[PDB]
């Protein structure tokens, strides 16, 4: 598109909109720092020689001006180049109007709200002709496949397919989506943030993906066409989400939008924990302290499980003399020994043949929390006491993994090395998770 760019700003959203077609070329998030130790707002949508990510919309169909068959994309008229949300206003409207040769009027209006990342894109069509106008609305998100772990791609939702992801690589292989459904939405995802189009109509929306060429992937929707009778006026709506993947906020815009967060295959464990963590954060006022409390709470519900294996392993030391006696009695044959030392363990029914059972039970926990930590937008650049400014990121001074390690050594051949191995294993993990484990290992130390 080519014409001129207009600026629309709220407290949470900084947009750059092209009047030709009303596409959104730039989008900044003032509420979120670009990086840590930065004063610069995060940039979701970009239009660069190096990278592109836009939210496009307009009126297609047989008589839609944005339809390439009806000529060039419509150049909307605006009153000014700068729009700013007022102090005594919760809402900002940016109406742009186009009138064709036949005299029909096409009005496009961006209406933004304070503190809201959901931008409504609504249309008004006034038929001045003698024949009915057949118009369908659309909304398309396009983005470069390769950037200048988490999931970066597209996603959608239908009444049948409640949630489904779509990789850019699939789109890149020119194998595209082509489904239809009533309501629903399409979206492009990344860590902590997401764009989405949510149609508001009476029809059967058509969802699709598209290779736009030059390594540019796209996903969008095309609504069922509506008829605007002569002399009459018609209206068409859609909602553009652009910003953070906050679950409570996305639930109000459209159903199942909240699922845009990547909690991995261990999804059913992370979502309650985040609701749990957020529930604590409600009156504690801190994320780090909330994590310490949730640490205790998970330890509190798991006290029967920790005690049971301890009962067992205490018993294991009691049975160590007899096993060496087996070794002496049967000699050096693994079959008889292993089966019957096992048989003893099983017979006395305390030992699960696992001292690493504490490890494999913490397999879901580590992962679930990790995905929560790395996926939750609320924990992004979340503050903790002392020298921790980002809970989602690793400790910059690498102190907390060493902290963890010393607590770990303090729990008194390969096991004579593994407490330090955890220091380097935890150098590559978020401080929040390390914090969790330090506190959790403190619970064992307090147990002592």
UniProtKB/Swiss-Prot annotation:
The keyword Electron transport does not apply. It is found in: Cell inner membrane. The chain crosses the membrane at residues 283-303, 353-373, 391-411, 419-439. Keywords: Cell inner membrane, Cell membrane, Chaperone, Membrane, Protein transport, Transmembrane, Transmembrane helix, Transport. InterPro entries: Membr_insert_YidC (IPR019998), Membr_insert_YidC_N (IPR028053), YidC/ALB3/OXA1/COX18 (IPR001708), YidC/Oxa/ALB_C (IPR028055), YidC_ALB_C (IPR047196), YidC_periplasmic_sf (IPR038221). GO terms for molecular function: membrane insertase activity. GO terms for biological process: protein insertion into membrane; protein transport. CDD domains: 5TM_YidC_Alb3 (cd20070), EcYidC-like_peri (cd19961). One of its GO terms (cellular component) is plasma membrane. Belongs to the OXA1/ALB3/YidC family. Type 1 subfamily. Required for the insertion and/or proper folding and/or complex formation of integral membrane proteins into the membrane. Involved in integration of membrane proteins that insert both dependently and independently of the Sec translocase complex, as well as at least some lipoproteins. Aids folding of multispanning membrane proteins. This is Membrane protein insertase YidC.
């Amino acid at each position: 598109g080519q014409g001129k760019l207009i600026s629309v700003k709220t407290d949470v959203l900084d947009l750059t909109i092209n009047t030709r077609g009303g596409d959104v070329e730039q989008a900044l998030l003032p509420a979120y720092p670009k990086e840590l130790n930065s004063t610069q707002p995060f940039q979701l949508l970009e239009t660069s020689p190096q990278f592109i990510y836009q939210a496009q919309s307009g009126l297609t169909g047989r008589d839609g001006p944005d339809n390439p068959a009806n000529g060039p994309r419509p150049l909307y008229n605006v009153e000014k180049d700068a729009y700013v949300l007022a102090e005594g206003q919760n809402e900002l409207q940016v109406p742009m109007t186009y009138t064709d040769a036949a005299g029909n009027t096409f009005t496009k209006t961006f209406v933004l709200k304070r503190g809201d990342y959901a931008v409504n894109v609504n249309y008004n069509v006034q038929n001045a002709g003698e024949k009915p106008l057949e118009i369908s609305t659309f909304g398309q998100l396009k983005q470069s496949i390769t950037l200048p772990h988490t999931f970066r791609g597209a996603a959608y939702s239908t009444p049948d397919e409640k949630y489904e992801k779509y990789k850019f690589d699939t789109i890149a292989d020119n194998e595209n989506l082509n489904i239809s459904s009533k309501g629903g939405w399409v979206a492009m995802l990344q860590q902590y943030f997401a764009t989405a189009w949510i149609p508001h109509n009476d029809g059967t929306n058509n969802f699709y993906t598209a290779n736009l060429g030059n390594g540019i992937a796209a996903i969008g929707y095309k609504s069922q066409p509506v008829l605007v009778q002569p002399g009459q006026t018609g209206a068409m709506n859609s909602t553009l989400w652009v910003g953070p993947e906050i679950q409570d906020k996305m639930a109000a815009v459209a159903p199942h939008l909240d699922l845009t967060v990547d909690y991995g295959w261990l999804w059913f464990i992370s979502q309650p924990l985040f609701k749990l963590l957020k529930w604590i954060h409600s009156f504690v006022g801190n994320w780090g302290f909330s994590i310490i409390i949730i640490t205790f709470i998970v330890r509190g519900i798991m006290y029967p499980l920790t005690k049971a294996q301890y009962t067992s392993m205490a018993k294991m030391r009691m049975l160590q003399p007899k096993i060496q006696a087996m070794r002496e009695r049967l000699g050096d044959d693994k079959q008889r020994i292993s089966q019957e030392m096992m048989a003893l363990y099983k017979a006395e029914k305390v030992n699960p043949l696992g001292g690493c059972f504490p490890l494999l039970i913490q397999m879901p926990i580590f992962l679930a929390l990790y995905y929560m930590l790395m996926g939750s937008v609320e924990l992004r650049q979340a503050p903790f006491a002392l020298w921790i400014h980002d809970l989602s990121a690793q400790d910059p001074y690498y102190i907390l993994p060493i902290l963890m390690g010393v607590t770990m050594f303090f729990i008194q051949k390969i096991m004579t090395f593994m407490p330090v191995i955890f220091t380097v294993f935890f150098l590559w993990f978020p401080s929040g998770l390390v914090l969790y484990y330090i506190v959790s290992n403190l619970v064992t130390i307090i147990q002592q």
